[PDB]
Design a protein around this nucleic acid. Sequence first.
RNA 1: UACACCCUGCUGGUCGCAUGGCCUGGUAGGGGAAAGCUUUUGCGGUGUGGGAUGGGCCCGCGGCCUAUCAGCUUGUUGGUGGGGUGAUGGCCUACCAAGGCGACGACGGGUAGCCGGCCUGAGAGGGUGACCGGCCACACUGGGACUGAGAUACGGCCCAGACUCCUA
RNA 2: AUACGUAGGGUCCGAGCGUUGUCCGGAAUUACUGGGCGUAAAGAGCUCGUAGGUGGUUUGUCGCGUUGUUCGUGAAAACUCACA
Lengths: 92, 130, 84, 200, 122, 113
Amino acid sequence: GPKYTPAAEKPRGRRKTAIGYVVSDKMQKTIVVELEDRKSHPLYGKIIRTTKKVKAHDENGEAGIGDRVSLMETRPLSATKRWRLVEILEKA
Amino acid sequence: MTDPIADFLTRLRNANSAYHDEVTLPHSKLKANIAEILKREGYISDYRTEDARVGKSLVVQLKYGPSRERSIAGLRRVSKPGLRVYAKSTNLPRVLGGLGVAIISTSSGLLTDRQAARQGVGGEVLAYVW
Amino acid sequence: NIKSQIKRIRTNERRRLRNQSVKSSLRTAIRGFREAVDAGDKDKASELLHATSRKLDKAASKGVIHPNQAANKKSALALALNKL
Amino acid sequence: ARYTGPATRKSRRLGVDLVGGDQSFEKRPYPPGQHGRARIKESEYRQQLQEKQKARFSYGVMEKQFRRYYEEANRQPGKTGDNLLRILESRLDNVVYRAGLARTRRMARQLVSHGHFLVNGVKVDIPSYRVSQYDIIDVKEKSLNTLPFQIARETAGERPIPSWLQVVGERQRILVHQLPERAQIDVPLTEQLIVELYSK
Amino acid sequence: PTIQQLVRKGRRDKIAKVKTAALKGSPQRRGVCTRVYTTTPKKPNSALRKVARVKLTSQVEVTAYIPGEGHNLQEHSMVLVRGGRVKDLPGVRYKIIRGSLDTQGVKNRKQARSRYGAKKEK
Amino acid sequence: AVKIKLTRLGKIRNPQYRIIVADARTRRDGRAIEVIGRYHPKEEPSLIQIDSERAQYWLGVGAQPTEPVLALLKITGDWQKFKGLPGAEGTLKVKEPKPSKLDLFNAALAEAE
RNA sequence: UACACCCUGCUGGUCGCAUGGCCUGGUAGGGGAAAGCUUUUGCGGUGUGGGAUGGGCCCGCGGCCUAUCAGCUUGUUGGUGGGGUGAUGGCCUACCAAGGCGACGACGGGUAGCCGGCCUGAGAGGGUGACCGGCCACACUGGGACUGAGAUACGGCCCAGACUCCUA
RNA sequence: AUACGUAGGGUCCGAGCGUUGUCCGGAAUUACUGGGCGUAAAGAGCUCGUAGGUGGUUUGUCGCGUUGUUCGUGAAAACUCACA
């Protein structure tokens, strides 16, 4: 038979992507983004709404304070920075 | 002031209980449809909306039979603020074991227990009257 | 505790002792290539990169270093030559 | 396992026929002892306890085997009162007794003790054996030729065979057909008290 | 009551109300008894009840009752203490098993015949 | 590597076996990747019921049955499909026909009357 | 000798998740192996392409208590370039910058392996991780290293103590 | 003294039968289901307001919450139904 036998494409993607607001675009190639949750309480039923301060990598510095942006998770790119700013749709 | 629909139901309860044969109300579409379905199933006599303070006003006549007896048995908002309530297609509660009727604000609009059971969508129930 | 495998003890001592000299020699060659590249001489760097791409590839074919560490070092020295 | 005492004293205490034809119990219907005459502090507790004790002592069944009867009856889809009476009317010794082939409950108890019966071809020395519908039943010849068992089989003028049991030949073949039905059992005092008490 | 305030905090039970304190909730412990002096029960129940104070192996010093009529235990005895509840006596919530490690069963006990360490009559 | 194994089940005196596929480094009763058969020496015909085509796949990728597992494979004729040397045929025996639940009482009634 | 493979220089096409991915891309330069025994059912060796299964890393979410525990934080955070690693990544390291974490409870004190489950309870709920199963951690103690595809290496090793034993 | 102790005599259970230890429910005795706070437990001495929760009438959007649906999915045993 052929010397070379081929491989597969392992359908890949769907890295977690969500809409956040840039809030601490302060450090070089670095932004901090926040998210919203709306979850029914396990016991009572009072839907609580909380947040989360993810750290994202901006190689370009496009974002800024209070911008409605989107983020996809990457490979771990540093100690607490695991997000890629893509599909920006609001500033300020 | 926090809750308008609870005050709607409280006024219905007091006015019917205190033997009044009518009640007047501001006309926000929510309570409008609540009283609309109420007369639809016949726990009240008839509702009519006219013009008032900047909005409009709905006036509700309570159905009383041969004596001063109310077809309404009672009213209680369930999906209140701070405890808003959602329900699904399967476990659609049966009011008074199924005797009564309820309000369930479906994604397709507004439906009761039996209607939503015949159809099968859920998401938000409200007060029930029996 | 002694149980029917001191032969493994001697085997592992030998296996980890040969790699000591092998790794010392390879690291000395790599450091020499480092002085070649930092000195700014490109012919010596090219020849040392050639020799080390031979040597570390041999060592990876042998049982001293995993295949990919050798490729990493080969690429690093190759770029060090390519830019000097 | 097995109890020891006779049935006359328990008959008198519980105040019901446990032998069925106990001459001495009707001779002394009051409970045994110096104070069977003395009136009891009546309680529905006593009513239910008397009911369950009559049920236990009538068939030769015994208490721990009796509790699991109620538990499995409650596990059944039907109402527990029906299921308990059905299963208590579904015992191997009960099946062979209602055919009129044993003059006493202890008759069948000691018969299954000895191994004088056969269900579907397998010998079961276990009175707690369950006999299903359409089971083939037979009696061994060693007991068949025994004199008192000859009397029991040939003078079987005892209680009639219920519709769910059918002795269909000289081989004492009790070709069971259906379950003991509530409309067919003709049970002694009911068991709703047992269900209500145990459920609490 | 302020569902949100429940989310903030709340909904804990009141108090354990512990009963046994020998140790480990032990079905029984063993130890050395002392101070076997008899004290007085409540005035309406005028009598005198024989008790002792036992230092159990659990390294706690508790008060045990001596049930029955006769006793076998004395000072420096390997008494097996079990939990009990004697409302007739103040602060006495223990007993010592008869027919056991140290204390011989109560002599000629026949109404109980299992308690009080009364073995089977031959 | 990978091996097709017999794993033990049932109570003490009567053994039963599930034909599983698993790593060697596991134990006799580890997490089965897939149950592909079952077998019981205790029952009369040593009756075996095997998921066939999954075994075909696993033999294709290189599953290596245990010695009695391989014996069972031959007992099925499954080893005559992946290897396919003579072709696959029914090799295992079967439990005897035996009467039914209803015909027993039918015959009993016929005998009685 | 390999070019089946890897590294580099350039470059064509192609899919994109941005790093990039695919054409054993190509090109050109460079480099990388092996085995015998045995007649004997034959067993065996090297390299690569693929399966299979075993894995290694990261993340969503779930599940102790205690401010009579409210500040914590400098390799901490981000970037850069490297060292190192199987691969990412302050993992490490030189510089740069000052961030980052918390009342939606940090940082502390105490406490505990955890789940399929099991048991009670009508239900919710509550209590447990017996055994049978699923993983993890640990194998005088504490530090260190080894090898192999793979090591807290329980019946592998060294070093610092403990303890014990033998002792010229 | 039918309560003690003793005898019968009776109740029940049975190779068991009682005692201790622990957990759940009964307890609504944490009251989400399913509690209260004038006199029984419970409105700080009184203000404002950060955090937080929390919302008037009405137009269009989004469908996050929420619901509807397809599928992957939740080892075996679990536990149950049904069969042997």
